Write a protein that binds this ligand. Structure first.
Ligand SMILES: Cc1cc2nc3c(=O)[nH]c(=O)nc-3n(C[C@H](O)[C@H](O)[C@H](O)COP(=O)(O)OP(=O)(O)OC[C@H]3O[C@@H](n4cnc5c(N)ncnc54)[C@H](O)[C@@H]3O)c2cc1C
Ligand SMILES: NC(=O)c1ccc[n+]([C@@H]2O[C@H](COP(=O)([O-])OP(=O)(O)OC[C@H]3O[C@@H](n4cnc5c(N)ncnc54)[C@H](OP(=O)(O)O)[C@@H]3O)[C@@H](O)[C@H]2O)c1
Ligand SMILES: Cc1cc2nc3c(=O)[nH]c(=O)nc-3n(C[C@H](O)[C@H](O)[C@H](O)COP(=O)(O)O)c2cc1C
Length: 608
């Protein structure tokens, strides 16, 4: 387990802080919201700190009242995030009295998902049960609409509520730097970071175990085009994890740390008139903080912009707010300044011109030519470049030393006028098997798993790239049959546009079906006729048999792919099947299916 830092309350006392903001975050959204709230404190005569609850023992919350006008805020996203597990387990377990504790929670969720803001709601509810007093209403941010805006709305009401309760004054301050720039003219190249994530030279000198902090650089042994046509580009990659000691199972995910497009990095440097090869460090102006830098330093701006910073997603409102000061044309400074509005034209412009048009930082620098911020401050403002997850497309029973990836390359026309390229997929696509192509990765254990007993029936639904984990599932069920095991029915419900356009793993699937590994290979070709044909239309077609498998055969259902519409439509079709054959009313059919998920017989691996 992690070695906990010493009491966060004592740390707050020693540094004159009265507010602490904890972040439950997986892809850094809640973390950035916490950082923003922590920084806001200064604007109201207070002082805060942002913190990862995993590095602390939240039992010390009971000591928080020892600090006058103290308050704790929780920015929690749902998936309970890995870093919030300890805190979560603690909440359920303790009977500690948090009398005198003042709190507020802001949840990050997405309605297209089952348990919307479950974590956020739990924390807010539990702290009250334990005796603490809510200082502001629970926030319910929905990433399906616009999370940034929900945060803005909440934040705007939160602070005045806080000032009113503690009797503090709102004042309105000038720009404040979190880090100071230190340029290094003399530096042993052996101490300059070049893209590694953890220890310096950890990419060059690999040492297990390998994880998110110390990714394993896996060699790309294969990278082939899966689709037959040219409308899009879908690919299959095989990463060699030999000698990595990494363990995995069909259903797990593989994460990769990509590199941004070099041309995009070069242009940002060029438009800002900056020398990207300058070696430097951004050092926290708060020498007490454990966050010494915003990213591994010392390093060059080029390396930072390539491996450490997100330069492709639309900049958040606070970033544009802080950049406004560097736009010399009044109208541009005004537009940038107003992006953080909670209503009106400023808000509408942010939603349409930045978010909807998908303008990345370079696009904004190009379209607002008066905006010329210094490179070091920009690097301090940009979010960190995140790893991308993929559903491992292979079975470890068959490929113990290789992790396969099935992915669609992202490349689309943005309303901003440019063609936007997906970071990880463009980078993966360019990896050519060999001075060999290496991909920094690690595996994340999931709960998406084949049944324990070989005899249990399996129903897999995964159109498009949703086929990914099922290639592994099928490889494994085929292996079991080869091993003399008794394997129940294995049905695949797959979907693509046309058999001659993007039928992924066409030959492999035909083989598994021929050999009996697949009991049924049901494929919906959505564009081979005037009307759409989807996997759920095939599920409805086979309702009688599927009900038999589910109700009498104890079958396990698996859905993978599009979380936005496909997953929901498929779930609805299952409701209808249950409703008809139970038989039972729709409401009871829903409870039936929801119960299957709790009992591990209806699993999901969907993304958007
Ligand atoms: C658990 C999990 C499993 C996953 N499994 C797989 C998998 O097995 N195979 C796979 O291909 N992907 C999978 N993904 C998705 C994957 O992690 C990446 O999100 C995806 O590959 C795109 O990454 P990228 O870096 O190439 O694109 P990025 O640079 O990250 O850009 C992605 C963003 O581009 C924007 N965008 C995409 N198209 C448009 C458009 N047409 N118009 C406007 N905006 C658009 C959206 O905001 C999208 O979020 C999975 C994701 C999760 C979370
Ligand atoms: O993501 P990706 O790029 O991997 O996949 P994708 O190619 O965009 O979609 C895979 C298949 O799913 C179909 N589909 C679209 N909406 C669906 C829905 N609501 N329910 C069931 N199937 C649906 C698509 O048909 P269409 O794209 O023809 O709708 C396509 O045939
Ligand atoms: C695999 C996956 C599963 C998710 N499951 C849920 C969920 O059950 N409930 C919910 O409200 N949001 C869910 N979300 C949405 C996130 O909670 C939302 O995007 C949040 O903003 C992410 O914050 P982070 O970057 O700080 O982790 C999911 C997102 C992904 C990618």
């Amino acid at each position: 387990p992690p070695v906990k830092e010493s009491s966060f309350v004592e740390k707050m006392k020693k540094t004159g802080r009265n507010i602490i903001v904890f972040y439950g975050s997986q892809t850094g959204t809640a973390e950035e919201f916490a950082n923003r709230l922590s920084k806001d404190a200064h604007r109201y005569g207070m002082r805060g700190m942002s913190a990862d609850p995993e590095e602390y023992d939240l039992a010390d919350l009971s000591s928080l009242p020892e600090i006058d006008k103290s308050l704790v805020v929780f920015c929690m996203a749902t998936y309970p995030t890995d870093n919030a597990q300890d805190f979560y387990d603690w909440l359920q377990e303790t009977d500690v009295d948090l009398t005198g504790v003042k709190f507020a929670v802001f949840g990050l969720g997405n309605k297209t998902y089952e348990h919307f803001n479950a974590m956020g709601k739990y924390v807010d509810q539990r702290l009250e049960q334990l005796g603490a007093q809510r200082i502001f209403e629970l926030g319910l941010g929905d990433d399906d609409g616009n999370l940034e805006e929900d945060f803005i709305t909440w934040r705007e009401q939160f602070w005045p509520a806080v000032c009113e309760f503690f009797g503090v004054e709102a004042t309105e301050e000038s720009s404040i730097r979190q880090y100071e720039l230190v340029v290094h003219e003399d530096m042993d190249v052996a101490k300059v970071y070049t893209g590694e994530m953890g220890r310096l030279k950890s990419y060059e000198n690999q040492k297990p175990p390998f994880d998110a902090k110390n990714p394993f650089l896996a060699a790309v042994t294969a990278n082939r085009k899966l689709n037959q046509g040219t409308e899009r580009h879908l690919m299959h990659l095989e990463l060699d994890i030999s000698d990595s000691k990494i363990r995995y199972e069909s259903g797990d995910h593989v994460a990769v740390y990509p590199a941004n497009d070099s041309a995009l990095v070069n242009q940002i440097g060029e438009i800002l008139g900056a020398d990207l090869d300058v070696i430097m460090s951004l050092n926290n102006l708060d020498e007490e903080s454990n966050k010494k830098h915003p990213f591994p330093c010392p390093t060059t701006y080029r390396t930072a912009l390539t491996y450490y910073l997100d330069i492709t997603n639309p900049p958040r409102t606070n970033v544009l707010y802080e950049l406004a000061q560097y736009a010399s044309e009044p109208s541009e400074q005004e537009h940038l300044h107003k992006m953080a509005s909670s209503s009106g034209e400023g808000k509408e412009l942010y939603l349409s011109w930045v978010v909807e048009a998908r303008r990345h930082i370079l696009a904004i620098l190009q379209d607002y030519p008066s905006l010329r911020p210094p490179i070091d401050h920009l690097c301090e403002l940009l979010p960190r470049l995140q790893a991308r997850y993929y559903s491992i497309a292979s079975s470890s029973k068959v490929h113990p030393n290789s992790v396969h990836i099935c992915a669609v390359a992202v490349e689309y026309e943005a309303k901003s006028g440019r063609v936007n390229k997906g970071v990880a997929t463009s980078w993966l696509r360019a990896k050519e098997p060999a001075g060999r192509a290496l991909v920094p990765m690690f595996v994340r254990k999931s709960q998406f798993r084949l049944p324990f007993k070989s005899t249990t029936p399996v129903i897999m639904v995964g159109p498009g790239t949703g086929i990914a984990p099922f290639m592994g599932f099928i490889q494994e069920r085929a292996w079991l049959r080869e091993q003399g095991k008794e394997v129940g029915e294995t049905l695949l419900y797959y979907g693509c546009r046309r058999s001659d356009e993007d039928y992924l793993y066409r030959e492999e699937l035909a083989r598994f079906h021929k050999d009996g590994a697949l009991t049924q290979l049901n494929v919906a070709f959505s564009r081979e006729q005037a009307h759409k044909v989807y996997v759920q239309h095939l599920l409805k077609r086979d309702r009688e048999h599927l009900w038999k498998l589910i109700h009498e055969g104890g079958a396990h259902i698996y859905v993978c792919g599009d979380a936005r519409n496909m997953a929901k439509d498929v779930q609805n079709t299952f409701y209808d099947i249950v409703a008809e054959f139970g038989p039972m009313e729709h409401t009871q059919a829903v409870d039936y299916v929801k119960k299957l998920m709790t009992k591990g017989r209806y699993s999901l691996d969907v993304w958007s």
